[PDB]
Amino acid sequence: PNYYLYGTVLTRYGLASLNHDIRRGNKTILQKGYWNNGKIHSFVGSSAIRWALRFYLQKQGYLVNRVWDEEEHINRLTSEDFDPEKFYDDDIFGFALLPNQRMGALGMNMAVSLTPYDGAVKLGAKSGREKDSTSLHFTEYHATRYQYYFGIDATHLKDFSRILPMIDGIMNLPKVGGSSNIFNYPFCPDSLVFQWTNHFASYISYCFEYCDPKSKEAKLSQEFIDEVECGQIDPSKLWIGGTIVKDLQQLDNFESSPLNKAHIYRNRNEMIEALKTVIKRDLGL
Amino acid sequence: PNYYLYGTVLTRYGLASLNHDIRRGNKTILQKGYWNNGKIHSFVGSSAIRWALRFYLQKQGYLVNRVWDEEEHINRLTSEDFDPEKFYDDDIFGFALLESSTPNQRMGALGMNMAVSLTPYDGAVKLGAKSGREKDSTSLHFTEYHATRYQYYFGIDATHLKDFSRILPMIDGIMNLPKVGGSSNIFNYPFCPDSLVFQWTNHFASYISYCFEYCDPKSKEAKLSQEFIDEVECGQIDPSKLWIGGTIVKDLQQLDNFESSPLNKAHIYRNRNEMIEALKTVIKRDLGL
Amino acid sequence: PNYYLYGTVLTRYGLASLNHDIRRGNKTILQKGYWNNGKIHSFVGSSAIRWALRFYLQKQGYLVNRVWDEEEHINRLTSEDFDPEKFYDDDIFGFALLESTPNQRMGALGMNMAVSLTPYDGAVKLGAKSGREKDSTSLHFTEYHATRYQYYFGIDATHLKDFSRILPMIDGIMNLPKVGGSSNIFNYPFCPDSLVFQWTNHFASYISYCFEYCDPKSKEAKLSQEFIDEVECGQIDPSKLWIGGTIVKDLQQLDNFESSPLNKAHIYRNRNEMIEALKTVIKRDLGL
Amino acid sequence: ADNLVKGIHWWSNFWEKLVIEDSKEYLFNQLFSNREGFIIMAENSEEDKQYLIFIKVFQQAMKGNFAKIYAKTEEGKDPPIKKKVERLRAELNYCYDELSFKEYLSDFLVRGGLNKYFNEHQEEIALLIKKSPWQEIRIWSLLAIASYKP
Amino acid sequence: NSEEDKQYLIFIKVFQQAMKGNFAKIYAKTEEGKDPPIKKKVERLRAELNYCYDELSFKEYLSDFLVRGGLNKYFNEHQEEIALLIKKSPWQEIRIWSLLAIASYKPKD
Amino acid sequence: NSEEDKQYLIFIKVFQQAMKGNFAKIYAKTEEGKDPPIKKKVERLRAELNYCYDELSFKEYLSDFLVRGGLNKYFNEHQEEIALLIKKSPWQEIRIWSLLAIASYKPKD
Amino acid sequence: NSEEDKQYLIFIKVFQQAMKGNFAKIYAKTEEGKDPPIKKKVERLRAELNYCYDELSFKEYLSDFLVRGGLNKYFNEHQEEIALLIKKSPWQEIRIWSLLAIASYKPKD
DNA sequence: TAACAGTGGCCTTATTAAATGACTTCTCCATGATCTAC
Secondary structure, rough: OEEEEEEEEOOOEEEEOOOOOOOOOOOEEEEEEEEOOOOEEEEEOHHHHHHHHHHHHHOOOOOOOOEEOOOOOOOOEEEOOOOOOHHHHHHHHHHOOOOOOOOOOEEEEOEEOOOOOOOEHHHHHHHHHHHHOOOOEEEOOOOEEEEEEEEHHHHHOHHHHHHHHHHHHHHHOOOOOOOOOOOOOOEEEEEEEEEEEEOOOOOOOOOOOHHHHHHOOOOOOOHHHHHHHOOOOHHHHHHEOOOOHHHHOOOOOOOOOHHHEEEOOHHHHHHEEEEEEEHHHOOOO | OOOOOEEEEEEOEEEOOOOOOOOOEEEOEOOOEEEEOOEEEEEEHHHHHHHHHHHHHHOOOOOOOOOEEEOOEEEEOOOOOOOOOOHHHHHHHHHEEOOOOOOOOEEOEEOOOEEEEEEOOOEEEEEEEOOOOOOOOOOOEEEOOEEEEEEEEEEHHHHHOOOOOHHHHHHHHHHOOOOOOOOOOOOOOOOEEEEEEEEEOOOOOOOOOOOEEEEOOOOOOEEOOOHHHHHHOOOOOOHEEEEEEEHHHHHOOOOOOOOOHHHHHHHHEEEEEHHHHHHHHHHHHHHOO | OOOOOEEEEOOOEEEEOOOOOOOOEEOOEEEEEEEOOOOOEEEOOOOHHHHHHHHHHHHHOOOOOOOEOOOOOEEEEEEOOOOOOOOOOHHOOOOOOOOOOOOEOOOOOOEEEEEEEEEEEOEEEEEEEEOOOOOOOEEEEEEOOOEEEEEEEEEEHHHHHOOHHHHHHHHHHHHHOOOOOOOOOOOOOOOOOEEEEEEEEEOHHHHHHHHEEEOOOOOEEOOHHHHHHHHHHOOOOOHHHHEEHHHHHHHHHHOOOOOOOOHHOEEOEEEEEHHHHHHHHHHHOOOO | HHHHHOOOOOOOHHHHHHHOOOOOOOHHHHHHHHHHHHHHHHHHOOOOOOOHHHEEEEEEEHHHHHHHHHHHOOOOOOOOOOHHHHHHHHHHHHHHOOOHHHHHHHHHHHHOOOHHHHHHHHHHHHHHHHHHHHHHHHHHHHHHOOOOOO | OOHHHHHHHHHHOOOOOOOHHHHHHHHHHOOOOOOOOOOHHHHHHHHHHOOOHHHHHHHHHHHHHHHHHHHOHHHHOOHHHHHHHHHOHHHHHHHHHHHHHOOOOOOOO | HHHHHHHHHHHHHHHHHHHHHHHHHHHHHHHOOOOOOOOOOHHHHHHHHOOOOOOHHHHHHHHHHHHOOOOOOHHOOOOOOHHHHHHOHHHHHHHHHHHHHHHOOOOOO | OHHHHHHHHHHHHHHHHHHHHHHHHHHOOOOOOOOOOHHHHHHHHHHHHOOOOOOOOHHHHHHHHHHHOOOOOHHHHHHHHHHHHOOOOHHHHHHHHHHHHHHOOHHHH
């Protein structure tokens, strides 16, 4: 049976400069665009998160075709012929020769800042005296939480057991490409909405929303909550975990709401363990 | 009788790059063109949605002539001669054998129009670059994306189907559409409906094509158009043949004087599954399944 | 194994004018921006703290490629080719030689900008060149801020060329020299007064900014309720949590502290004892 | 010849017939061979000298843009005119509506440095850029690229 | 010439006068050396104009630059027209006009 | 035309009157043979305008500037309109309007 | 509409009335052929308003100012809600509103 | 009541601007010699 794991994760609050766009002149341009309300929102590309997952797989065994050298800052291919049956990297993220080309068992969308980006520019100077063209520069940061949506086709994996390391990596994401030296931003999630269903219809994409411009309270939603109440998104297939649980359980009439009978855990590790148990049972691992 | 299922379906809000065309040098251009009031919108081809429906029929286990190999990325025909009586895809989407007893072509029961972005295309682009200091001609590149909802219009000639019962899998596929051809690795855009306006009538005329509008040029609002509401008010569209489901139901119910409007007596369901179940019951009763 | 030392350090209360912005007119402004609740907080750049750490490494002997002259205010490179094996600063902070052994290094230290615990409301200090003569460079204004500062850092210990170089880095974080700013008129010691360190072997931290204020115009500081909930719910293994500083008294004054899972963490009122225990654990884990 | 027969401008459909319908720069390469014919046709134009002024402005801007990188790149590392012209043509082809094309053209003109031809014809060229359809400006930019003398 | 074209040309002249003032201020500031750069100033202006990402930021930068220009006689003569043009027009079009003014600028001999 | 445009234009007039009053006050302040300011006072006004953060500081400074301007007829006729305009509206937009008024105040003096 | 600005406007009105009453009291204070200043009264009021340092200061100051305002009718039918408005809201916002009222006071006299 | 409203120096250094392959498939002919039926 076809099984898909859709999820939207919310990162912790902090100052982020992850995805510089093009360096317009003196400024490192944080990647941004219009979103939701017609306001400019900073973005983190999905390729950055895929690179972070690749690095997580490489750092802990998990034979991978592409090996990040981490010293020469180059990628080396163990086998020039991609073999999804042996390497986790080829099996999960796919490839393209330009063959087989795979298709990619993990589909991910760009991470979107939960808050509009106002100006958030940081000045940078190089010590003192003998000033040159590189002495003065500016960098664009952003003090918000990032939110991205991913989808996994579990049946598409060459080895079904490889979905568990991917979940572990998503919950233990390494440095997502960015200015870690100056703006160290952990990309581990503090709020999760996972759906382990068996049809290609997900209504949890970018569920988290708070606007309230400059803040970090990060309420869940009203459209997603209405979707749960109306009858679809059955709570048995819904997994909610993280700091959003505290706000969810404080809502009025929560006990009588259909959202109550969803798998809701305040501890992320407990929900991950329960979800992995369900996944292993369903996939015959 | 001759029954048709017309429908306009609106997708969820997200970042989409599903409609690339011939690339201009470095940057990957997504298909776009002029639309309402002269602004440029991004279009998703209807062949993409037809391919997604075909893939849904194949995955669900229905007998399909053209089998798509996921591992090989090739298309294989189980029977070289198209047989609409036996194969779902030939019956629904038709065929046309053009090469130098059985008919060589079929008109196809399903008729679909292009998917149009609800919001005009602003011009957003995203830079991609291969990691590593060893950089070559294929190091950095640009991909255009659009943060919008896509709406598309489809029509089904139920009587044209060789087997009348095949309309139900098509509705299920429309409500459970697989990935619509695009860049799923970096722009995973779910194409499942979140707002429907269906019409199950024996009259050939349809006034529901592209009935959704935006409240603000750059916003995720997706309100029902004033022309469609006016045509419901004037009595042109029979409310008993109207099926509205999805998130637009809330906005409709918050409208002033909704209880006195003829739009009230239409089949309105917040839950899309309930609307689909009721519509399928009506369709089965009408077609005698 | 891949061991990481995350940590959030809270400074002492005092008048601060550390990191400034573009010159503008006669008034030197702080680096400020919206942080929480839509209020404007003052920031201290992480490059300033990195410079202070480099200066600490230089002062206490050690081998640093960059040598701050301290007399002509110039930077001299002992070797034009960066050698992370030999020099402490190249090993820790990395390098990037772009003008045209690898020419670039990612560095083992990752810092974030220090955020004032208190919103910045007013606090502009009038400054005069004095005398009776007056000129353009006579009347000037300098912004200050009476607040504590709090920043978050992470160390990839395995990324270090020499695994033992983490210990001088912890010592420098403890005895940090002056962080770049107008120390002549606003002397602000950046030595920590409260610490929340985590020595774990996975990438998730959940301890980014654990300190929050009470009575937004006061010097009092407390651990954020989100952090306490994170500790109590089961996440954040207490055995990997090192808490030390003046926040220890407030933590121990909490009700049901003994029954709380937070009691099982390594809690030391004296910062030196906490640092010694943490360094013992680090030396045991890294095989030093 | 077809444009002359139809009674329209001789450059009426140059873009969609010379760049869009070009497979492997087969049609594009012939522009630099017909550069002399382009120059003759522009010089002996029956009317519309303002767009020849625009040709001069765009050629000066192209000279500045190319010279920037050619000074950045030393001998041996200097790429031929072919690669830069191909990149410029691709960037021109990227533009899809009036706003994007005019933004790109204006940024290109600014990056071209000081432009004496633009300065001597401020009002005329400014009005021409603001008012004329962007497709015509793109076509004339293409044929100014074709008749560009290094 | 239509009224829109007249206001567009007046805005071009206003921006050119503002650049004259800013470059004169720079020249006075860096009189030292063989000669203050001119191409570098234009590149700085282009980069700063391209940095703007939304209407508010671009209009803030444009107003700041115009004020830094100085007297700007063409703005003296056309308060209401130019003010309404800046307030109303989309920021992308105003940026296009500003860059056209930059390109069509003649440094004083 | 349009109410918002009229309010914006007459707010520009209000700000220009306020700057006239402040500059007259500066003129009265200086004495003897020292040259009274003309342009560097405008630069000081610009620097004070950009030295602004959050809604509170800028509105405080704007109100203080308007009061220091003294008598002004444009604010006299329109109390409710300008009071609402200043109290409402983002402070950055009002700063943009103030800078636009600065750049076009000079035809008066 | 949205009676918050209604409260803002009638606060401005009663502030203008109170300052008119205080200026009348000052007119009573002065004597002889000396011209009673009007602009200097506004300057003194602004300086005293800027003299405060939050909460206690400027709250008792402005309450005392309104009390010396005299028989203010709009105050009389708007005692309770204006008192509630003063008790709530940040004091700097009240100062901004007061300064705007001063800047828009004259056409009464 | 007064006098000032910053004095400096920089405004990015590199690097790479795409890598493939496809560029319609069928059919509908016109006309006269001859066969053939009336």
